[PDB]
PDB file of C-alpha atoms in Angstrom:
ATOM      1  CA  UNK A   1     192.259  51.347  34.505  1.00  0.00           C
ATOM      2  CA  UNK A   2     192.877  47.907  35.649  1.00  0.00           C
ATOM      3  CA  UNK A   3     194.911  48.795  38.885  1.00  0.00           C
ATOM      4  CA  UNK A   4     194.521  52.445  38.771  1.00  0.00           C
ATOM      5  CA  UNK A   5     192.990  52.466  42.187  1.00  0.00           C
ATOM      6  CA  UNK A   6     193.482  50.785  45.694  1.00  0.00           C
ATOM      7  CA  UNK A   7     196.756  52.512  46.501  1.00  0.00           C
ATOM      8  CA  UNK A   8     199.141  49.737  47.945  1.00  0.00           C
ATOM      9  CA  UNK A   9     201.575  50.888  50.600  1.00  0.00           C
ATOM     10  CA  UNK A  10     203.939  47.983  49.827  1.00  0.00           C
ATOM     11  CA  UNK A  11     204.908  49.267  46.231  1.00  0.00           C
ATOM     12  CA  UNK A  12     204.425  52.906  44.830  1.00  0.00           C
ATOM     13  CA  UNK A  13     205.150  56.135  46.595  1.00  0.00           C
ATOM     14  CA  UNK A  14     203.433  59.689  46.126  1.00  0.00           C
ATOM     15  CA  UNK A  15     200.260  58.386  44.320  1.00  0.00           C
ATOM     16  CA  UNK A  16     198.319  57.954  47.596  1.00  0.00           C
ATOM     17  CA  UNK A  17     194.729  58.825  46.670  1.00  0.00           C
ATOM     18  CA  UNK A  18     193.219  62.321  48.268  1.00  0.00           C
ATOM     19  CA  UNK A  19     189.879  64.012  48.194  1.00  0.00           C
ATOM     20  CA  UNK A  20     190.902  67.540  47.056  1.00  0.00           C
ATOM     21  CA  UNK A  21     188.770  70.727  46.773  1.00  0.00           C
ATOM     22  CA  UNK A  22     190.548  73.013  44.339  1.00  0.00           C
ATOM     23  CA  UNK A  23     189.825  76.505  43.659  1.00  0.00           C
ATOM     24  CA  UNK A  24     190.193  77.749  39.743  1.00  0.00           C
ATOM     25  CA  UNK A  25     190.755  80.861  38.297  1.00  0.00           C
ATOM     26  CA  UNK A  26     190.647  82.199  34.710  1.00  0.00           C
ATOM     27  CA  UNK A  27     191.893  84.720  32.614  1.00  0.00           C
ATOM     28  CA  UNK A  28     188.819  84.993  30.810  1.00  0.00           C
ATOM     29  CA  UNK A  29     187.284  88.377  29.789  1.00  0.00           C
ATOM     30  CA  UNK A  30     184.349  87.844  32.274  1.00  0.00           C
ATOM     31  CA  UNK A  31     184.130  89.641  35.500  1.00  0.00           C
ATOM     32  CA  UNK A  32     186.095  88.856  38.422  1.00  0.00           C
ATOM     33  CA  UNK A  33     183.928  87.492  41.231  1.00  0.00           C
ATOM     34  CA  UNK A  34     186.381  87.260  44.458  1.00  0.00           C
ATOM     35  CA  UNK A  35     188.079  89.830  46.266  1.00  0.00           C
ATOM     36  CA  UNK A  36     189.454  89.378  49.874  1.00  0.00           C
ATOM     37  CA  UNK A  37     188.377  91.547  52.568  1.00  0.00           C
ATOM     38  CA  UNK A  38     192.046  92.150  53.577  1.00  0.00           C
ATOM     39  CA  UNK A  39     191.270  91.853  57.298  1.00  0.00           C
ATOM     40  CA  UNK A  40     190.151  95.495  57.251  1.00  0.00           C
ATOM     41  CA  UNK A  41     191.677  98.043  59.690  1.00  0.00           C
ATOM     42  CA  UNK A  42     190.425 100.513  62.440  1.00  0.00           C
ATOM     43  CA  UNK A  43     187.958 103.312  61.339  1.00  0.00           C
ATOM     44  CA  UNK A  44     190.335 106.143  62.559  1.00  0.00           C
ATOM     45  CA  UNK A  45     188.828 109.959  62.729  1.00  0.00           C
ATOM     46  CA  UNK A  46     189.820 113.432  63.014  1.00  0.00           C
ATOM     47  CA  UNK A  47     193.188 113.012  61.802  1.00  0.00           C
ATOM     48  CA  UNK A  48     195.305 112.808  58.812  1.00  0.00           C
ATOM     49  CA  UNK A  49     195.351 108.860  57.219  1.00  0.00           C
TER      50      UNK A  49
ATOM     51  CA  UNK B   1     178.233  96.600  28.746  1.00  0.00           C
ATOM     52  CA  UNK B   2     181.428  95.511  29.942  1.00  0.00           C
ATOM     53  CA  UNK B   3     180.207  92.022  30.670  1.00  0.00           C
ATOM     54  CA  UNK B   4     177.782  93.642  33.236  1.00  0.00           C
ATOM     55  CA  UNK B   5     174.418  92.629  33.108  1.00  0.00           C
ATOM     56  CA  UNK B   6     173.269  95.864  35.103  1.00  0.00           C
ATOM     57  CA  UNK B   7     169.572  96.433  35.730  1.00  0.00           C
ATOM     58  CA  UNK B   8     167.962  99.526  36.460  1.00  0.00           C
ATOM     59  CA  UNK B   9     164.471 100.056  37.537  1.00  0.00           C
ATOM     60  CA  UNK B  10     161.745 102.125  39.809  1.00  0.00           C
ATOM     61  CA  UNK B  11     158.194 101.677  40.528  1.00  0.00           C
ATOM     62  CA  UNK B  12     155.869 104.743  40.751  1.00  0.00           C
ATOM     63  CA  UNK B  13     151.844 105.148  40.886  1.00  0.00           C
ATOM     64  CA  UNK B  14     150.055 106.876  37.969  1.00  0.00           C
ATOM     65  CA  UNK B  15     146.446 107.979  37.454  1.00  0.00           C
ATOM     66  CA  UNK B  16     145.991 107.184  33.658  1.00  0.00           C
ATOM     67  CA  UNK B  17     144.109 104.523  31.625  1.00  0.00           C
ATOM     68  CA  UNK B  18     146.629 104.835  28.430  1.00  0.00           C
ATOM     69  CA  UNK B  19     150.035 106.408  27.492  1.00  0.00           C
ATOM     70  CA  UNK B  20     152.524 106.960  29.324  1.00  0.00           C
ATOM     71  CA  UNK B  21     152.901 109.864  32.508  1.00  0.00           C
ATOM     72  CA  UNK B  22     153.926 113.328  31.771  1.00  0.00           C
ATOM     73  CA  UNK B  23     156.180 113.245  34.966  1.00  0.00           C
ATOM     74  CA  UNK B  24     159.669 112.563  35.344  1.00  0.00           C
ATOM     75  CA  UNK B  25     161.465 110.025  37.887  1.00  0.00           C
ATOM     76  CA  UNK B  26     164.687 108.605  37.939  1.00  0.00           C
ATOM     77  CA  UNK B  27     165.328 104.852  37.547  1.00  0.00           C
ATOM     78  CA  UNK B  28     167.691 103.708  40.816  1.00  0.00           C
ATOM     79  CA  UNK B  29     169.750 100.790  40.264  1.00  0.00           C
ATOM     80  CA  UNK B  30     168.826  97.369  41.547  1.00  0.00           C
ATOM     81  CA  UNK B  31     171.306  94.765  41.217  1.00  0.00           C
ATOM     82  CA  UNK B  32     174.451  94.350  38.806  1.00  0.00           C
ATOM     83  CA  UNK B  33     174.873  90.467  37.475  1.00  0.00           C
ATOM     84  CA  UNK B  34     178.587  89.934  36.352  1.00  0.00           C
ATOM     85  CA  UNK B  35     176.985  87.036  34.257  1.00  0.00           C
ATOM     86  CA  UNK B  36     179.555  88.037  31.175  1.00  0.00           C
ATOM     87  CA  UNK B  37     177.815  85.963  28.510  1.00  0.00           C
ATOM     88  CA  UNK B  38     176.926  87.857  25.142  1.00  0.00           C
ATOM     89  CA  UNK B  39     173.391  88.936  24.489  1.00  0.00           C
ATOM     90  CA  UNK B  40     172.076  89.819  21.182  1.00  0.00           C
ATOM     91  CA  UNK B  41     168.302  88.610  21.402  1.00  0.00           C
ATOM     92  CA  UNK B  42     165.537  89.116  23.828  1.00  0.00           C
ATOM     93  CA  UNK B  43     162.180  88.088  24.377  1.00  0.00           C
ATOM     94  CA  UNK B  44     159.476  89.245  26.963  1.00  0.00           C
ATOM     95  CA  UNK B  45     157.037  86.730  28.704  1.00  0.00           C
ATOM     96  CA  UNK B  46     153.832  86.379  30.513  1.00  0.00           C
ATOM     97  CA  UNK B  47     151.167  84.517  32.251  1.00  0.00           C
ATOM     98  CA  UNK B  48     148.561  82.960  30.076  1.00  0.00           C
ATOM     99  CA  UNK B  49     145.037  81.377  31.603  1.00  0.00           C
TER     100      UNK B  49
ATOM    101  CA  UNK C   1     189.140  86.659  37.624  1.00  0.00           C
ATOM    102  CA  UNK C   2     186.706  83.681  36.641  1.00  0.00           C
ATOM    103  CA  UNK C   3     186.441  82.104  40.343  1.00  0.00           C
ATOM    104  CA  UNK C   4     185.147  78.554  40.213  1.00  0.00           C
ATOM    105  CA  UNK C   5     184.558  76.022  43.103  1.00  0.00           C
ATOM    106  CA  UNK C   6     186.073  72.781  41.570  1.00  0.00           C
ATOM    107  CA  UNK C   7     186.856  69.464  43.455  1.00  0.00           C
ATOM    108  CA  UNK C   8     188.877  66.564  42.390  1.00  0.00           C
ATOM    109  CA  UNK C   9     189.760  63.069  43.512  1.00  0.00           C
ATOM    110  CA  UNK C  10     193.080  62.282  42.277  1.00  0.00           C
ATOM    111  CA  UNK C  11     196.421  60.829  43.343  1.00  0.00           C
ATOM    112  CA  UNK C  12     198.302  62.973  45.762  1.00  0.00           C
ATOM    113  CA  UNK C  13     201.463  63.640  43.449  1.00  0.00           C
ATOM    114  CA  UNK C  14     199.019  65.247  40.904  1.00  0.00           C
ATOM    115  CA  UNK C  15     196.934  67.665  43.037  1.00  0.00           C
ATOM    116  CA  UNK C  16     200.292  70.099  43.389  1.00  0.00           C
ATOM    117  CA  UNK C  17     200.599  70.029  39.524  1.00  0.00           C
ATOM    118  CA  UNK C  18     197.705  72.540  39.151  1.00  0.00           C
ATOM    119  CA  UNK C  19     200.218  75.270  39.357  1.00  0.00           C
ATOM    120  CA  UNK C  20     199.884  78.218  36.730  1.00  0.00           C
ATOM    121  CA  UNK C  21     201.972  77.312  33.463  1.00  0.00           C
ATOM    122  CA  UNK C  22     202.571  73.511  34.745  1.00  0.00           C
ATOM    123  CA  UNK C  23     201.254  70.767  32.531  1.00  0.00           C
ATOM    124  CA  UNK C  24     200.390  68.187  34.887  1.00  0.00           C
ATOM    125  CA  UNK C  25     200.712  64.468  33.703  1.00  0.00           C
ATOM    126  CA  UNK C  26     197.424  63.427  34.730  1.00  0.00           C
ATOM    127  CA  UNK C  27     195.304  66.505  35.943  1.00  0.00           C
ATOM    128  CA  UNK C  28     196.132  68.523  32.904  1.00  0.00           C
ATOM    129  CA  UNK C  29     194.386  66.032  30.820  1.00  0.00           C
ATOM    130  CA  UNK C  30     191.270  65.727  32.987  1.00  0.00           C
ATOM    131  CA  UNK C  31     191.211  69.367  33.377  1.00  0.00           C
ATOM    132  CA  UNK C  32     193.472  71.888  31.378  1.00  0.00           C
ATOM    133  CA  UNK C  33     195.866  73.645  33.449  1.00  0.00           C
ATOM    134  CA  UNK C  34     197.574  76.366  31.257  1.00  0.00           C
ATOM    135  CA  UNK C  35     199.282  79.535  32.285  1.00  0.00           C
ATOM    136  CA  UNK C  36     195.876  81.152  32.279  1.00  0.00           C
ATOM    137  CA  UNK C  37     194.995  78.859  35.151  1.00  0.00           C
ATOM    138  CA  UNK C  38     195.268  80.108  39.035  1.00  0.00           C
ATOM    139  CA  UNK C  39     193.794  78.820  42.132  1.00  0.00           C
ATOM    140  CA  UNK C  40     194.283  77.009  45.424  1.00  0.00           C
ATOM    141  CA  UNK C  41     194.081  73.527  47.227  1.00  0.00           C
ATOM    142  CA  UNK C  42     192.403  72.107  49.894  1.00  0.00           C
ATOM    143  CA  UNK C  43     193.076  68.462  50.434  1.00  0.00           C
ATOM    144  CA  UNK C  44     191.807  65.915  52.735  1.00  0.00           C
ATOM    145  CA  UNK C  45     193.140  62.494  53.617  1.00  0.00           C
ATOM    146  CA  UNK C  46     190.570  59.884  51.658  1.00  0.00           C
ATOM    147  CA  UNK C  47     193.260  57.101  51.716  1.00  0.00           C
ATOM    148  CA  UNK C  48     191.240  55.617  55.086  1.00  0.00           C
ATOM    149  CA  UNK C  49     188.716  53.696  52.288  1.00  0.00           C
TER     150      UNK C  49
ATOM    151  CA  UNK D   1     223.422  56.642  45.282  1.00  0.00           C
ATOM    152  CA  UNK D   2     224.201  59.874  45.988  1.00  0.00           C
ATOM    153  CA  UNK D   3     222.524  61.695  49.125  1.00  0.00           C
ATOM    154  CA  UNK D   4     221.376  65.154  49.953  1.00  0.00           C
ATOM    155  CA  UNK D   5     223.522  66.983  52.493  1.00  0.00           C
ATOM    156  CA  UNK D   6     221.854  69.159  55.194  1.00  0.00           C
ATOM    157  CA  UNK D   7     223.048  70.873  58.107  1.00  0.00           C
ATOM    158  CA  UNK D   8     223.497  68.815  61.053  1.00  0.00           C
ATOM    159  CA  UNK D   9     223.580  64.901  61.235  1.00  0.00           C
ATOM    160  CA  UNK D  10     224.781  62.343  63.564  1.00  0.00           C
ATOM    161  CA  UNK D  11     223.465  61.811  67.209  1.00  0.00           C
ATOM    162  CA  UNK D  12     221.185  64.978  68.607  1.00  0.00           C
ATOM    163  CA  UNK D  13     220.593  65.374  72.247  1.00  0.00           C
ATOM    164  CA  UNK D  14     217.304  64.825  73.160  1.00  0.00           C
ATOM    165  CA  UNK D  15     215.524  68.294  73.981  1.00  0.00           C
ATOM    166  CA  UNK D  16     218.090  70.438  72.294  1.00  0.00           C
ATOM    167  CA  UNK D  17     218.111  72.712  69.624  1.00  0.00           C
ATOM    168  CA  UNK D  18     219.210  72.101  65.919  1.00  0.00           C
ATOM    169  CA  UNK D  19     219.292  74.051  62.495  1.00  0.00           C
ATOM    170  CA  UNK D  20     218.338  72.348  59.112  1.00  0.00           C
ATOM    171  CA  UNK D  21     219.759  74.197  55.948  1.00  0.00           C
ATOM    172  CA  UNK D  22     220.487  72.559  52.768  1.00  0.00           C
ATOM    173  CA  UNK D  23     223.798  72.335  51.442  1.00  0.00           C
ATOM    174  CA  UNK D  24     223.456  71.518  47.688  1.00  0.00           C
ATOM    175  CA  UNK D  25     223.047  74.173  44.958  1.00  0.00           C
ATOM    176  CA  UNK D  26     222.373  71.957  41.860  1.00  0.00           C
ATOM    177  CA  UNK D  27     218.531  71.976  42.638  1.00  0.00           C
ATOM    178  CA  UNK D  28     217.858  74.794  45.107  1.00  0.00           C
ATOM    179  CA  UNK D  29     214.723  74.813  47.322  1.00  0.00           C
ATOM    180  CA  UNK D  30     213.884  78.231  46.040  1.00  0.00           C
ATOM    181  CA  UNK D  31     213.176  77.126  42.575  1.00  0.00           C
ATOM    182  CA  UNK D  32     210.390  74.747  43.877  1.00  0.00           C
ATOM    183  CA  UNK D  33     209.511  76.954  46.930  1.00  0.00           C
ATOM    184  CA  UNK D  34     211.156  77.132  50.160  1.00  0.00           C
ATOM    185  CA  UNK D  35     210.039  74.157  52.399  1.00  0.00           C
ATOM    186  CA  UNK D  36     211.441  70.949  54.452  1.00  0.00           C
ATOM    187  CA  UNK D  37     210.047  67.369  54.363  1.00  0.00           C
ATOM    188  CA  UNK D  38     211.542  64.490  56.486  1.00  0.00           C
ATOM    189  CA  UNK D  39     211.341  60.694  55.723  1.00  0.00           C
ATOM    190  CA  UNK D  40     210.656  58.392  58.763  1.00  0.00           C
ATOM    191  CA  UNK D  41     212.484  54.956  59.037  1.00  0.00           C
ATOM    192  CA  UNK D  42     210.902  52.567  56.300  1.00  0.00           C
ATOM    193  CA  UNK D  43     208.985  54.276  53.345  1.00  0.00           C
ATOM    194  CA  UNK D  44     207.072  56.961  55.259  1.00  0.00           C
ATOM    195  CA  UNK D  45     206.846  60.690  54.099  1.00  0.00           C
ATOM    196  CA  UNK D  46     205.781  63.648  56.176  1.00  0.00           C
ATOM    197  CA  UNK D  47     206.120  67.554  56.338  1.00  0.00           C
ATOM    198  CA  UNK D  48     207.183  69.701  59.093  1.00  0.00           C
ATOM    199  CA  UNK D  49     206.713  73.030  57.936  1.00  0.00           C
ATOM    200  CA  UNK D  50     207.340  76.067  55.738  1.00  0.00           C
ATOM    201  CA  UNK D  51     207.601  79.769  55.765  1.00  0.00           C
ATOM    202  CA  UNK D  52     205.252  82.049  53.738  1.00  0.00           C
ATOM    203  CA  UNK D  53     206.492  85.830  52.244  1.00  0.00           C
ATOM    204  CA  UNK D  54     203.565  87.128  54.372  1.00  0.00           C
ATOM    205  CA  UNK D  55     205.727  86.247  57.467  1.00  0.00           C
ATOM    206  CA  UNK D  56     202.497  86.804  59.657  1.00  0.00           C
ATOM    207  CA  UNK D  57     201.325  83.400  59.768  1.00  0.00           C
ATOM    208  CA  UNK D  58     203.765  79.823  59.169  1.00  0.00           C
ATOM    209  CA  UNK D  59     202.380  76.662  57.759  1.00  0.00           C
ATOM    210  CA  UNK D  60     202.561  74.374  60.551  1.00  0.00           C
ATOM    211  CA  UNK D  61     202.291  70.408  60.113  1.00  0.00           C
ATOM    212  CA  UNK D  62     199.845  68.942  62.884  1.00  0.00           C
ATOM    213  CA  UNK D  63     202.453  66.457  63.990  1.00  0.00           C
ATOM    214  CA  UNK D  64     204.903  68.971  64.885  1.00  0.00           C
ATOM    215  CA  UNK D  65     202.690  71.984  64.952  1.00  0.00           C
ATOM    216  CA  UNK D  66     203.538  74.738  67.304  1.00  0.00           C
ATOM    217  CA  UNK D  67     206.910  73.173  67.724  1.00  0.00           C
ATOM    218  CA  UNK D  68     209.020  74.144  65.031  1.00  0.00           C
ATOM    219  CA  UNK D  69     210.291  77.622  64.118  1.00  0.00           C
ATOM    220  CA  UNK D  70     211.684  79.506  61.042  1.00  0.00           C
ATOM    221  CA  UNK D  71     213.907  82.487  60.838  1.00  0.00           C
ATOM    222  CA  UNK D  72     213.789  85.073  58.761  1.00  0.00           C
ATOM    223  CA  UNK D  73     215.923  87.823  57.138  1.00  0.00           C
ATOM    224  CA  UNK D  74     215.659  90.618  54.634  1.00  0.00           C
ATOM    225  CA  UNK D  75     218.837  90.178  52.745  1.00  0.00           C
ATOM    226  CA  UNK D  76     220.125  86.597  53.679  1.00  0.00           C
ATOM    227  CA  UNK D  77     218.214  85.305  51.091  1.00  0.00           C
ATOM    228  CA  UNK D  78     218.139  82.072  52.531  1.00  0.00           C
ATOM    229  CA  UNK D  79     215.777  80.007  55.167  1.00  0.00           C
ATOM    230  CA  UNK D  80     216.938  78.219  58.239  1.00  0.00           C
ATOM    231  CA  UNK D  81     214.459  75.659  59.931  1.00  0.00           C
ATOM    232  CA  UNK D  82     215.034  75.749  63.797  1.00  0.00           C
ATOM    233  CA  UNK D  83     213.836  72.536  65.817  1.00  0.00           C
ATOM    234  CA  UNK D  84     212.595  72.843  69.373  1.00  0.00           C
ATOM    235  CA  UNK D  85     211.848  70.309  71.996  1.00  0.00           C
ATOM    236  CA  UNK D  86     213.218  67.246  70.028  1.00  0.00           C
ATOM    237  CA  UNK D  87     212.132  63.647  70.788  1.00  0.00           C
ATOM    238  CA  UNK D  88     213.428  60.183  70.113  1.00  0.00           C
ATOM    239  CA  UNK D  89     210.599  59.814  67.193  1.00  0.00           C
ATOM    240  CA  UNK D  90     212.214  62.915  65.615  1.00  0.00           C
ATOM    241  CA  UNK D  91     214.974  60.319  64.332  1.00  0.00           C
ATOM    242  CA  UNK D  92     214.358  60.555  60.413  1.00  0.00           C
ATOM    243  CA  UNK D  93     216.067  61.277  57.212  1.00  0.00           C
ATOM    244  CA  UNK D  94     215.664  64.977  56.352  1.00  0.00           C
ATOM    245  CA  UNK D  95     215.510  66.066  52.870  1.00  0.00           C
ATOM    246  CA  UNK D  96     215.931  69.431  50.887  1.00  0.00           C
ATOM    247  CA  UNK D  97     212.382  70.603  49.162  1.00  0.00           C
ATOM    248  CA  UNK D  98     212.357  69.333  45.528  1.00  0.00           C
ATOM    249  CA  UNK D  99     209.689  67.932  43.144  1.00  0.00           C
ATOM    250  CA  UNK D 100     210.024  65.307  40.477  1.00  0.00           C
ATOM    251  CA  UNK D 101     208.193  67.871  38.037  1.00  0.00           C
ATOM    252  CA  UNK D 102     208.253  71.425  37.453  1.00  0.00           C
ATOM    253  CA  UNK D 103     205.922  73.268  39.921  1.00  0.00           C
ATOM    254  CA  UNK D 104     205.997  76.319  42.218  1.00  0.00           C
ATOM    255  CA  UNK D 105     203.823  77.009  45.031  1.00  0.00           C
ATOM    256  CA  UNK D 106     203.249  76.587  48.857  1.00  0.00           C
ATOM    257  CA  UNK D 107     201.477  73.628  50.169  1.00  0.00           C
ATOM    258  CA  UNK D 108     201.229  71.571  53.575  1.00  0.00           C
ATOM    259  CA  UNK D 109     200.796  68.177  52.170  1.00  0.00           C
ATOM    260  CA  UNK D 110     202.907  65.210  53.062  1.00  0.00           C
ATOM    261  CA  UNK D 111     203.388  64.305  49.464  1.00  0.00           C
ATOM    262  CA  UNK D 112     204.379  67.625  48.511  1.00  0.00           C
ATOM    263  CA  UNK D 113     208.303  66.750  47.788  1.00  0.00           C
ATOM    264  CA  UNK D 114     209.917  63.392  47.150  1.00  0.00           C
ATOM    265  CA  UNK D 115     213.350  62.434  45.896  1.00  0.00           C
ATOM    266  CA  UNK D 116     215.316  59.222  45.070  1.00  0.00           C
ATOM    267  CA  UNK D 117     218.310  60.554  46.654  1.00  0.00           C
ATOM    268  CA  UNK D 118     218.635  59.867  50.275  1.00  0.00           C
ATOM    269  CA  UNK D 119     218.782  62.811  52.670  1.00  0.00           C
ATOM    270  CA  UNK D 120     220.941  63.707  55.760  1.00  0.00           C
ATOM    271  CA  UNK D 121     220.597  60.859  58.431  1.00  0.00           C
ATOM    272  CA  UNK D 122     219.638  62.310  61.976  1.00  0.00           C
ATOM    273  CA  UNK D 123     219.520  59.879  64.818  1.00  0.00           C
ATOM    274  CA  UNK D 124     218.006  61.378  68.110  1.00  0.00           C
ATOM    275  CA  UNK D 125     218.022  59.546  71.443  1.00  0.00           C
ATOM    276  CA  UNK D 126     218.083  60.201  75.270  1.00  0.00           C
TER     277      UNK D 126
END
């Protein structure tokens, strides 16, 4: 932890700190809570569809 | 059941002082909470002066 | 299934290690990332400060 | 040290068009996910663009947003990156998408990919 922070461009590549919001999904038995709208479609009528 | 805390309820008027009405009235659903936590005990609460 | 809103402040190279079935060198220990884990990423440039 | 081989290289006319395709087969981009990234002179890494399976929207990099285009084919089983309106600042080494650790997915971050082996040297000038 002595120098785990304070990214230095001079040395070290790829360890730049980033503030990231990460969605988390799990395969637990609990019910799901997300279902995408799919962007929907126009409501056709009076025709086979 | 199935991890869904389904709650069904309905409110109707009555004209009795004790016991329950002899009429019939289905309880429409209100909300469905997918909490998914196992439940084995319950207790009612009220307001005390 | 089991959608959660999670956020982290970790090095850039370890943000990509949250893919399912990947044992992140640092991310996994802080937060388990087994094959059952899934989600997305929303990263922001926090290197300004 | 060995260097990755990519289609193109050498002097490139300004404002022209060129194709960027990986030549090595030991570590193909498909294993780590199709994508492309370039290393600017010095030790700076940046991302250009990638193609998603949907084919309706392409992940565009703010630096070159709306500039680069990617062609798609059903049976070619390969991804070709096409550059449009090249500039002098585009001079930078081009690398094939490879990760130092096992992973699979789509992302639009500069530090998504990195490798020790150098990439094809591309010089653009007027």
